[PDB]
Every structure is written in C-alpha cells, then in structure tokens.
Enzyme design. Structure first.
Site, mmCIF file in Angstrom:
data_model
loop_
_atom_site.group_PDB
_atom_site.id
_atom_site.type_symbol
_atom_site.label_atom_id
_atom_site.label_comp_id
_atom_site.label_asym_id
_atom_site.label_seq_id
_atom_site.Cartn_x
_atom_site.Cartn_y
_atom_site.Cartn_z
ATOM 1 N N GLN A 206 -0.431 -8.829 -10.282
ATOM 2 C CA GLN A 206 -0.783 -8.736 -11.683
ATOM 3 C C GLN A 206 -0.873 -7.308 -12.131
ATOM 4 O O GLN A 206 -0.478 -6.965 -13.244
ATOM 5 C CB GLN A 206 -2.120 -9.427 -11.951
ATOM 6 C CG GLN A 206 -1.993 -10.883 -12.288
ATOM 7 C CD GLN A 206 -3.330 -11.567 -12.391
ATOM 8 O OE1 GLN A 206 -3.961 -11.862 -11.377
ATOM 9 N NE2 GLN A 206 -3.774 -11.828 -13.617
ATOM 10 N N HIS B 289 -3.170 -13.825 -2.742
ATOM 11 C CA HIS B 289 -3.644 -13.984 -4.125
ATOM 12 C C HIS B 289 -2.491 -14.444 -5.036
ATOM 13 O O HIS B 289 -1.935 -13.674 -5.834
ATOM 14 C CB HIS B 289 -4.259 -12.663 -4.615
ATOM 15 C CG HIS B 289 -5.110 -12.793 -5.845
ATOM 16 N ND1 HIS B 289 -4.682 -13.440 -6.984
ATOM 17 C CD2 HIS B 289 -6.344 -12.312 -6.129
ATOM 18 C CE1 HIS B 289 -5.612 -13.348 -7.919
ATOM 19 N NE2 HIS B 289 -6.629 -12.668 -7.424
ATOM 20 N N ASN C 51 -7.742 -16.232 -2.066
ATOM 21 C CA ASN C 51 -8.471 -16.133 -3.315
ATOM 22 C C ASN C 51 -8.116 -17.386 -4.107
ATOM 23 O O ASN C 51 -6.929 -17.662 -4.347
ATOM 24 C CB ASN C 51 -8.066 -14.906 -4.117
ATOM 25 C CG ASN C 51 -8.269 -15.111 -5.600
ATOM 26 O OD1 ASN C 51 -9.355 -14.877 -6.136
ATOM 27 N ND2 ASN C 51 -7.244 -15.633 -6.261
ATOM 28 N N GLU C 52 -9.150 -18.130 -4.494
ATOM 29 C CA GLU C 52 -9.020 -19.366 -5.258
ATOM 30 C C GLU C 52 -8.074 -20.432 -4.716
ATOM 31 O O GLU C 52 -7.088 -20.791 -5.352
ATOM 32 C CB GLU C 52 -8.725 -19.071 -6.731
ATOM 33 C CG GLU C 52 -9.883 -18.350 -7.432
ATOM 34 C CD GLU C 52 -9.751 -18.306 -8.944
ATOM 35 O OE1 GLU C 52 -8.673 -18.668 -9.468
ATOM 36 O OE2 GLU C 52 -10.739 -17.920 -9.606
ATOM 37 N N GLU D 126 -15.532 -12.457 -9.075
ATOM 38 C CA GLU D 126 -14.779 -12.612 -10.319
ATOM 39 C C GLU D 126 -15.622 -13.246 -11.442
ATOM 40 O O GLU D 126 -16.431 -14.163 -11.214
ATOM 41 C CB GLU D 126 -13.540 -13.470 -10.079
ATOM 42 C CG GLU D 126 -12.232 -12.854 -10.511
ATOM 43 C CD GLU D 126 -11.087 -13.276 -9.617
ATOM 44 O OE1 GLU D 126 -11.123 -12.895 -8.432
ATOM 45 O OE2 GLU D 126 -10.159 -13.979 -10.079
ATOM 46 N N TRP E 214 -1.280 -14.660 -16.131
ATOM 47 C CA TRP E 214 -0.394 -15.754 -15.731
ATOM 48 C C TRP E 214 0.085 -16.632 -16.883
ATOM 49 O O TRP E 214 1.286 -16.847 -17.056
ATOM 50 C CB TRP E 214 -1.071 -16.642 -14.687
ATOM 51 C CG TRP E 214 -1.581 -15.905 -13.494
ATOM 52 C CD1 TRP E 214 -2.867 -15.881 -13.037
ATOM 53 C CD2 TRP E 214 -0.809 -15.137 -12.567
ATOM 54 N NE1 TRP E 214 -2.942 -15.154 -11.877
ATOM 55 C CE2 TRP E 214 -1.695 -14.686 -11.562
ATOM 56 C CE3 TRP E 214 0.545 -14.793 -12.481
ATOM 57 C CZ2 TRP E 214 -1.272 -13.910 -10.483
ATOM 58 C CZ3 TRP E 214 0.966 -14.023 -11.408
ATOM 59 C CH2 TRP E 214 0.059 -13.590 -10.423
ATOM 60 N N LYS F 248 -4.112 -11.363 -23.090
ATOM 61 C CA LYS F 248 -5.451 -11.656 -22.621
ATOM 62 C C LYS F 248 -6.012 -10.509 -21.780
ATOM 63 O O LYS F 248 -5.977 -10.535 -20.548
ATOM 64 C CB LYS F 248 -5.445 -12.969 -21.837
ATOM 65 C CG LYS F 248 -6.806 -13.632 -21.713
ATOM 66 C CD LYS F 248 -6.682 -15.008 -21.087
ATOM 67 C CE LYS F 248 -7.910 -15.850 -21.347
ATOM 68 N NZ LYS F 248 -7.766 -17.157 -20.665
#
Length: 468
Positions: A19, A116, A159-160, A375, A429, A435
C-alpha cells in the site's frame, strides 16, 4: 486528571508494504494478484502508492520528529521471493535491511509482519492458503526472514487472517473475488492459521530471542435486540465466522464445541465440507502457548439481527451511506442502529466495542499475555488547507478509542501499545487514494509530506501520555 496512558507505552504508526511501498516492478519485485485486480476490475493502480520504497527516510524522520516510537511494516513476500519459492532476490532482501537500519537510526522500533495481503501471484493462483503445498512455501519464507533479519525484535506472521477470508471467498472484495463460499472461509482460516502456528513453533525451536505474534481483526458482534434469543444467536454465529474460530485455533489449539456446533450449522444451512487433520491440530496444539503477544486490529462493531432468508452481501466500496447490505442464511443480517454514528463507508464509530473485545479476549483466553492495538483510525477525504489538514474529526475518533484503552488497562487488560492507521497517507484497497488515514498528508502528485493537525496532536499525546 484525564485518562492517562502508561509511561512505557508505545505510540506507533502502522503501514503495509503493497500500500505504501511503491516500486511494484522496480528493482526485482515479483507480481501479486493485486496488480491486475486494481487495473481491470478497478480503475486506479498501486503505482506509485506513497513511494515508501524511496521515501522511507523522510517518513521515519517525521515519525521520530512527532513522537512515534514504533512502526508497523511488512516484508513484501514477492520482493524477497519473486515467485514465492526458489531463488532469493538479493535486491529485495537489501531494501529491507536498509529500511530497518533507518528504523533504529531514527528510534522507531520496527514491528514487522511477513504476510499483509501480498501472497505472490503465482502461489495465490495455485490456491493461496487453500493449497497445503503453499503452507510450506510460507513456512520457508518465514524461516528465511527469521534467519536473515536479526535487526527485528518484533515479528508477526499474518495480518488480518479473518478479513482475508471475508474478502476473497465471502464478500468477493479482494481477488479471487468469490462469494458466499463459507466452506472456503473456514478452510482458509484453518490452513492460514496452521501456517502461523508452524511459523511460531519454528521461531521458538531455532532459539531466536525476539517476540513472535499475530494481528487479528476483531470486530465486536452484538445481538440487535439483546432480549431476543434469536438475535443473541445471530451474533453468536456471526462472531464465530470472523472471530471465534480463529481466536480458538490460536489459544486452545483446537476448536471448542460452540465453535464447531456453529461451523457445522453454517455449513449445514449453506453447504460445505471441511478438511481438518490431526496433524493440523497437533501443530495448532503445539503453538498455543508460544505466541508472545496478540495484535488487535479494531475499527468498529457490528449488530446482527437473526433473520432467515437467502444470503446476500453488497459491498460499499464507493462510500454511499446505506448502500451496504449483508445477510447470511442460517445466521442473520447486519442491522446498524440509528442512534450510533456512521461514516460514508458505513463503518460504525463505536469505541466501547474495543474495550469489549479486549475484555472478551482477556477472559476467554488468559494465556494472551499482552495486547497491542496494531490498527485503528478513520479515513475520509481530508481537505488540504494551509498545507495541512484540520482533521479534528480523526483526532476525536482516535482520542475516544485511546480513552477506553486507559479503562481496559485500569481494569486488568495488559495492553502495551497503539498504532494509528496509517502513519502517512497510503493507497486504499477499495477506495484508492481518496480514503486518507494518516497523521501526515502525502501529496500524491509530488509525494510530499505535510504533517496534519492530528500529528501535532499525537505528539503531545505521545510525550505526556495524557489524553486530551
């Protein structure tokens, strides 16, 4: 007089490789499923992101400059191993060493995560984590990075893991883009979780004296009408998909009867078969008391209203208040209460849901040792004025969350740190570069950084542990 945070508290900023990084084709990087989905299935492309590949210098300097003693960064798997397994890309390994050197040069401790959302295209296509062959390639990659990078004291596997299931096989968001395949969601969780358990065990065996852990997204699930047994059940079964199945695998080294009872029910009503094995439970069971910390990625809570009917999910990626739809057969439907505030993407702004999850994890699983809010933040279309951004909005959201962080601590939860998302503005994403989440506004046209009002706020927070 107000809520006050620990002296030794880590006030960090988080980021993600694919990202922030940039340089997708530049310097040896191998492809990922994202490179195409963004292009064909979307509009905007990750290039140049926030140019972190060359701009890490300014960012770590600014981070140190505004009181950031911790930073979440992820090693781009496709950078190290272009295809996922085989010959190392010497150029890739280099960058990461240089990235960390700056971290220690700057006094911002690196908390590094390996995976990630960037599974190397080739492996992603070959089943991702629904293909056990791929579990080994990950195990290798983790093994490798552990050996190669001694600069890192804090390591994190995935991650997630839950959202990865949510987006790829349920809500069709991320590539592949499958929908309503709950057998896959559960299967993905089992396989990806086993992968992590094997990484964590290897780290311990090999002797490394740092700290390994996980970063779970834990959105609190509440029944719409608590007095309603159906709705209470609606939330029981909703929590079991995104939260309980994963947290169990992590701390019990198996799935308890409630989790199974519900997973069996979902798959009864929605169809599906699961491939669970004794070896998976032997591996999962062996690593349940080895996790050094737990990473809680909290953004909001959801309200479930148990309601029959066919399954349907409409994702609000554009940001249109109320365009969001979510209903699962045999589960319920999400129903956001009108008293509670929302943002344009229909994320509820409900701080207490955080405290509630902290307590949930603390009571359900004592062995958690310690917690890190890896986060949390608020992203909207920030307005650049006076070459800053008067994001009093963000400060208020993040502040509230930090306020209850004090409470959870005061009440027994061992929470040792906070990581706002993101440090500086990054690519999104579902939302592109619109955003904005960071403490530092990145002029994406000139890759410039201007610290927003939230930065100067954050600083005085970081250096006085007084929330106000």
């Amino acid at each position: 007089m107000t809520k006050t945070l620990p002296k030794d508290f880590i006030f960090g900023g988080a980021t993600a490789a694919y990202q922030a990084e940039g340089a997708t084709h530049t310097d040896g990087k191998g492809p990922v499923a994202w490179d195409k989905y963004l292009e064909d299935n979307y509009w905007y492309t990750a290039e140049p992101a926030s140019d972190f590949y060359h701009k890490y210098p300014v960012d770590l300097e600014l981070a140190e400059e505004y009181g950031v003693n911790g930073i979440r960064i992820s090693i781009a798997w496709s950078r190290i191993f272009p295809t996922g397994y085989g010959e190392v890309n010497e150029k890739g390994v280099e960058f990461y060493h240089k990235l960390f050197a700056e971290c220690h040069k700057r006094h911002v401790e690196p908390f590094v995560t390996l995976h990630h959302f960037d599974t190397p295209e080739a492996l992603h296509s070959n089943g991702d984590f629904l293909n056990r062959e791929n579990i080994e390639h990950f195990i290798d990659y983790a093994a490798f990075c552990f050996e190669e990078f001694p600069e890192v004291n804090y390591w994190t596997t995935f991650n997630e893991i839950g959202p990865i299931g949510d987006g790829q096989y349920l809500v069709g968001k991320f590539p592949p883009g499958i929908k309503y395949d709950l057998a896959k969601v559960f299967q993905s969780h089992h396989n990806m979780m086993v992968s992590h358990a094997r990484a964590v065990k290897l780290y311990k065996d090999k002797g490394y004296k740092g700290e390994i852990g996980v970063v779970h997204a834990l959105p609190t699930k509440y029944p719409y009408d608590p007095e309603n047994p159906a709705d209470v059940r609606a939330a029981e079964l909703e929590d079991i998909i995104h939260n309980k199945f994963i947290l169990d695998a992590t701390y019990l080294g198996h799935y308890c009867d409630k989790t199974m009872e519900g997973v069996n029910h979902i798959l009864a009503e929605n169809g599906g078969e699961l491939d669970l094995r004794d070896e998976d439970f032997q591996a999962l069971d062996a690593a349940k008391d080895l996790n050094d910390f737990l990473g809680i990625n909290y953004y909001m809570s959801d309200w479930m209203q148990a309601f029959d009917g066919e399954t349907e999910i409409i994702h609000n990626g554009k940001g249109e208040k109320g365009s969001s739809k979510y209903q699962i057969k045999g589960v319920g439907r999400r129903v956001a209460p009108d008293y509670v505030p929302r943002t344009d993407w229909d994320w509820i702004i409900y701080p207490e849901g955080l405290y509630d999850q902290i307590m949930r994890v603390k009571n359900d699983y004592p062995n958690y040792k310690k917690i890190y809010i890896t986060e949390n933040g608020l992203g909207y279309k920030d307005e650049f004025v006076d070459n800053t951004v008067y994001d009093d909005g963000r400060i208020d959201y993040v502040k509230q969350h930090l306020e209850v962080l004090s409470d959870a601590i005061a009440d027994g939860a061992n929470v040792k740190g906070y990581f706002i998302w993101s440090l500086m503005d990054v690519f999104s994403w579902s939302n592109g570069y619109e955003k904005r989440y960071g403490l530092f506004y990145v002029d994406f046209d000139t890759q410039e950084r201007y610290p927003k009002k939230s930065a100067h706020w954050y600083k005085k927070l970081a250096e006085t542990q007084v929330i106000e």
